[PDB]
Design a protein around this ligand. Structure first.
Ligand SMILES: CC(C)(COP(=O)([O-])OP(=O)([O-])OC[C@H]1O[C@@H](n2cnc3c(N)ncnc32)[C@H](O)[C@@H]1OP(=O)([O-])[O-])[C@@H](O)C(=O)NCCC(=O)NCCSC(=O)C[C@@](C)(O)CC(=O)[O-]
Ligand SMILES: [Mg+2]
Lengths: 296, 296
């Protein structure tokens, strides 16, 4: 049955902002994050210590992590694509980092010119350094419900890559459907295989709403026992490998579904909505949250 | 568990066009319906034989029903609020009519201007005529998951009304979540109470996507065994007398989910999308179908 509590992983200021056409000032990023903490979120992916030469929207990573209020008990993980970035994250005060891979060979090769297996070597240093520093590492597997290049992805393959991340030291791995082509059965089959090798509590899903399947795919995940899901404030985000259609599952809409289900989230919807409106105005875009649209 | 086949009841030409300030021309309405016939839907709610006073957008019901092409196999149900309307429906060639009430007293008052018991009177008169003519009758129970006026609605209340419509002669009854405030748990409870009194085959769900819960609310129903669901093309819709009524689950996003689940619908997605694009340009609005947006 459904879990009693769900840990929402707010990715809006990171995954969301990274995939937005307009960029926002550093103070705006900081305000948004402070507003998400005040909304009650347990974890808020803050930024990415990535070469400003490859992704400018995240250029203020250092000053952002250092500028945000650190609410008691709230986690503020940051992406570290390589060892240099990991080092910059540590020096800036990061206590948790996120590394990423894919369950698809084609996707991996087109992105870093190496196989899935080879893509892990890049982490070994990060993984060992993080351990020597008492720093938590979150894993992420994209193409979990399908790949824009290979198409359908085998559950067994997703289970193998998640397993690898898990045994390498990732305390939690988030399964992603960034192109958003997944449907309930695909989610089910994938989770079923992954749960064989990895303990349920170490799992999370990150569904994009590109095809309007995000919430439905998420509920299936919840039905399978998963208790941590990723979402972006007001549906902020998008995928470079897909068309016009939106990106991330809207946090407010997920919260609305969980409150209705009587599932504890510890999030104040009213305040969450305020955060959503703030960043949307600063980004000059209409919210992608249906709850937001209907409420005001 | 999940049915191998689902009968999608397309309501775009009625419920979809119903709440729309700028009236649509008769030829456009006719054109939308033939295009939907083209896409392969097996049921298309054509129009409402109701007073032009309450809903003028539907005032051309007579000519619309007469002008559309009657494809082989496809059904073209039309709303009939009373014997007066049912009268004009049969004269216009209707092979199936739809009576509509609610589990809410206030909403009944404000929608069809009468009490719940009183609507049972009108309907009983319609079912009387229908039987002797073999003109099948479908029923609607609005506010199945809450009322914008009375708030919480009980599963027992919805089951009671549904039971009434069923015992009087309705072959099928659609449980419409008018304002889209429902969440999976609420949907499951309502369906369970209803299933005790009325057989599954005669049940259908009609979910609005005001809060982004339509697809997920619908998946819950499919898991409960319901095999017929209502939806509108480009996610158009909203009851003019529900207050705050947003669009209906987008038919394109529903077929995408079903096809994903390997569930037969008999609908041609590409052609459905064309129909969606057609009506949208006609209303001069952006489609609400996520799928349509990811296509181009
Ligand atoms: C029930 C009544 C009759 C109210 O009844 P009443 O207004 O209280 O008065 P009445 O019954 O004595 O007569 C009404 C007036 O309508 C006329 N009339 C009646 N039928 C016709 C006709 N065919 N052609 C020409 N005129 C007609 C009639 O001639 C008269 O006019 P007057 O002489 O004063 O001008 C109806 O008019 C009404 O209230 N309609 C509202 C429309 C409505 O209910 N729309 C919502 C559709 S349902 C929905 O959206 C929910 C659903 C299905 O989508 C699923 C879900 O979400 O749950
Ligand atoms: Mg409706």
């Amino acid at each position: 049955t459904l879990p009693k509590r769900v840990k929402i992983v707010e990715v809006g200021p990171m995954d969301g902002l990274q995939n937005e056409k307009n960029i926002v000032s550093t103070p705006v990023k900081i305000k948004l994050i402070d507003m998400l903490s005040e909304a009650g979120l347990s974890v808020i992916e803050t930024t990415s210590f990535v070469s400003p030469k490859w992704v400018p929207q995240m250029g203020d990573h250092t000053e952002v992590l250092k500028g945000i209020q650190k609410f008691p008990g709230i986690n503020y993980p940051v992406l570290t694509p390589n060892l240099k970035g990991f080092e910059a994250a540590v020096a800036a005060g990061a206590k948790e980092v996120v590394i990423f891979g894919a369950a698809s060979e084609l996707f991996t090769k087109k992105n870093i010119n190496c196989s899935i297996e080879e893509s892990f070597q890049r982490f070994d240093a990060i993984l060992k350094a993080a351990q020597s520093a008492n720093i938590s590492v979150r894993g992420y597997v994209s193409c979990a419900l399908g790949c824009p290049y290979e198409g359908k992805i085998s559950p067994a393959k997703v289970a193998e890559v998640t397993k690898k991340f898990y045994s390498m030291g990732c305390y939690e791995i988030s399964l992603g459907d960034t192109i958003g082509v997944g449907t309930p059965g695909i989610m089910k089959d994938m989770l079923s295989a992954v749960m064989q090798e990895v303990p349920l509590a170490a799992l999370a899903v990150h569904c994009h709403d590109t095809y309007g399947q995000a919430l439905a795919n998420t509920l299936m995940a919840l039905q399978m026992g998963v208790s941590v899901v990723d979402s972006s404030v007001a549906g902020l985000g998008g995928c470079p490998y897909a068309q016009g259609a939106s990106g991330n599952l809207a946090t407010e809409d997920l919260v609305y579904m969980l409150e209705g289900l009587g599932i504890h989230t510890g999030v104040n919807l009213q305040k969450l909505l305020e955060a959503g409106n703030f960043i949307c105005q600063a980004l000059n875009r209409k919210t992608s949250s249906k709850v937001a649209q209907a409420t005001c």
